Amino acid sequence: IVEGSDAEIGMSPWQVMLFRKSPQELLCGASLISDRWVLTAAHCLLYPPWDKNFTENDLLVRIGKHSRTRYERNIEKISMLEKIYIHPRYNWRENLDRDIALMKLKKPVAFSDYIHPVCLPDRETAASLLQAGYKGRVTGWGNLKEGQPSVLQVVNLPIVERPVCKDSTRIRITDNMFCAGYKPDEGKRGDACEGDSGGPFVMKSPFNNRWYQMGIVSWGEGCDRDGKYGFYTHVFRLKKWIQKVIDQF
């Protein structure tokens, strides 16, 4: 995260760390959406251009963490993967369209003060809060600049108008994507960065006061560059895919 702050303890109890077994190291962000389902970006697991294609057996998810590197005894839980599911139309060849994946844990994770699922939005929550100007929050252990944080980092970011997202890049942006970030104008700044990938873009509903994951950290051009904005997978847009996978398995 660029230009963000240390998280408070318990602040993002749904925050999940994707971890490489050997070499042990951070893979990506991710989130907890029930007791054995973890939501992340497809490109965390599959990205042929960089020779990324993981299997279940190559990974663990580390739930309830605060510190990046330390094995938080008595606090974090670490689970194994029953099965990786990637969106069957995820577009890694062109623009990361539908950048999304589900992970089933081998056994259920025990909820605690530091571990708790986030909600997934409903059309109406999605319709009400997915508005230019509306701020969401992004969290992750990724780069601090376009180095590494000691603890989970956090930044709040405004959702940017669609033509501005579009006018900010050469890539083709779709309806399964949104962008967030301040303008050069707005003085304030902040952004996700490499290693934040697959983490949650969440919002707090003013209607029922629960947190909803509206987005997944997906991509950008540099980190925290003026006139550039971060791109997020539009979680409501693919929720019928999320439900299908969940129902079926």
Partner: peptide, 27 residues
């Protein structure tokens, strides 16, 4: 059912230090 409610914050009716910046953005 209890998603999105944080044991150390909403369940204790404790606010985090910047959650209001989100609220305030929600005209």
């Amino acid at each position: 059912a209890d998603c999105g409610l944080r044991p150390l914050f909403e369940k204790k009716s404790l606010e985090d230090k910047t959650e209001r910046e989100l609220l305030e953005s929600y005209i």
